[PDB]
Design a protein around this ligand. Structure first.
Ligand SMILES: [Cl-]
Ligand SMILES: [Cl-]
Length: 164
C-alpha cells in the first residue's frame, strides 16, 4: 500500500464537481476548489486549475494530475512546517503516510494544532497518541476515516486499509 492508494480509498474519485463532507465544492480525488458557496466561483477555480474550459467536468488523467500536485504540496507543506517536520522525520514509512493523510484533509495549519498528539507521536507513545487524536472534532465529524488513520498511527501496519 502507498500514500496514493491510501488517499484514493479515503477520498474516492469523482469527475464532476461535488460537495465534500463540509459542503465545500470539490472535484477529482478530494481536490478542494473553493470554500465559497458559489458554484460559479467553483467552476472558475476549476478551469483555472486545469487550464481549459471544463464546465464542471474533468477527465481521469486530469483528476490524477491534480492528485499528484496535491500529494506533493502536502508533503512539502509538512517539510516546511517547524512543528510538523520533526514529527514526520521521526516516523517509520507507514506512519508517515498517516501524517500525510491528515495534512491532505485538514491542511498544515489544522494538523499543526494537534500539539499534544504530535508530541506523543514523536515520543512513539502509540496508544496514548491514538486516544488523544480521538478527542477532536475531526474524529467526531468523520469517524470512519479518522479511525483508519488513527489505527495506522497506532500499529504502523496497513491493517485498517485491508479489505477496502
Ligand atoms: Cl472531543
Ligand atoms: Cl468517515
Amino acid at each position: 500500500m502507498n500514500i496514493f492508494e491510501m488517499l484514493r480509498i479515503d477520498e474516492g474519485l469523482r469527475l464532476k464537481i461535488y460537495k465534500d463532507t463540509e459542503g465545500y465544492y470539490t472535484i477529482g480525488i478530494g481536490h478542494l476548489l473553493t470554500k465559497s458557496p458559489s458554484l460559479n466561483a467553483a467552476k472558475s477555480e476549476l478551469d483555472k486549475a486545469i487550464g481549459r474550459n471544463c464546465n464542471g467536468v474533468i477527465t481521469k488523467d486530469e483528476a490524477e494530475k491534480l492528485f499528484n500536485q496535491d500529494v506533493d504540496a502536502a508533503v512539502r507543506g509538512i517539510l516546511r512546517n517547524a512543528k510538523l517536520k520533526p514529527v514526520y522525520d521521526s516516523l517509520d514509512a507507514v506512519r508517515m503516510c498517516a501524517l500525510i493523510n491528515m495534512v491532505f484533509q485538514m491542511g498544515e495549519t489544522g494538523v499543526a494544532g494537534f500539539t499534544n498528539s504530535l508530541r506523543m507521536l514523536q515520543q512513539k507513545r502509540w496508544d496514548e497518541a491514538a486516544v488523544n487524536l480521538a478527542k477532536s472534532r475531526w474524529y467526531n465529524q468523520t469517524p470512519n476515516r479518522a479511525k483508519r488513520v488513527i489505527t495506522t498511527f497506532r500499529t504502523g501496519t496497513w491493517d485498517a486499509y485491508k479489505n477496502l
